[PDB]
Each structure stands twice: as structure tokens, then as C-alpha cells.
Amino acid sequence: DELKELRTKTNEQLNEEILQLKGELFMLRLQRSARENFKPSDFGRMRKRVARMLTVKREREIEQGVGKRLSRKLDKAWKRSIVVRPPPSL
């Protein structure tokens, strides 16, 4: 199971997919609290996949060439404006 598609997707759909997987992770928290039948493995590979997404995004931060604190100011400059949106699975 190789995630070859993540280095093919551009940065906008990368970041939107990060937000969608985080929203699906919150739905897995609600379904875990609801005691409905759920897969804990999906709760694993959800967060574990967002780790892959942010490693690819952070490598794309590396090959431009900027500081670590510039990635702190850029990342926290982005995290301040994230309007919550439910996932398209309805």
C-alpha cells in the first residue's frame, strides 16, 4: 500500500484533503462516542495519513528554501483563518 498519489497532487488539493481528513477524524470521534460500529484502523490511518500529507507539504516547504521560523510564521499565519466545514460525505 504505497501512497504515490500524494506527490502528484498540487498544494491546494493537498491542503483541502488535510482539512477533509481532519473533519472525517472528528466524525470518527463522534461515531466512537456514539458506540456505533466503527473501524479503529480508519481512526489510525486517518491521523497517520495526515502525517504523510504534512511531510510532503513540509518537504515542499524545504525545496523552496526558507527558515524553520518562517515555516512557523507561515503555518501559524495560515492556521488562524480556517473556517470549519463538514466533509462532503453526507
Binding site: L25, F26, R29, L30, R32
Partner: peptide, 15 residues
């Protein structure tokens, strides 16, 4: 600015 930037997709945990 908010008072603190706090990873808004994890601001709720469980009912």
C-alpha cells in the same frame, strides 16, 4: 486575531 490559535478541527473532543 483570536486569543490563541488552537487547531480548530480538534477544539471538540467527545459528547
Amino acid at each position: 486575531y483570536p486569543r490563541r490559535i488552537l487547531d480548530v478541527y480538534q477544539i471538540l473532543q467527545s459528547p
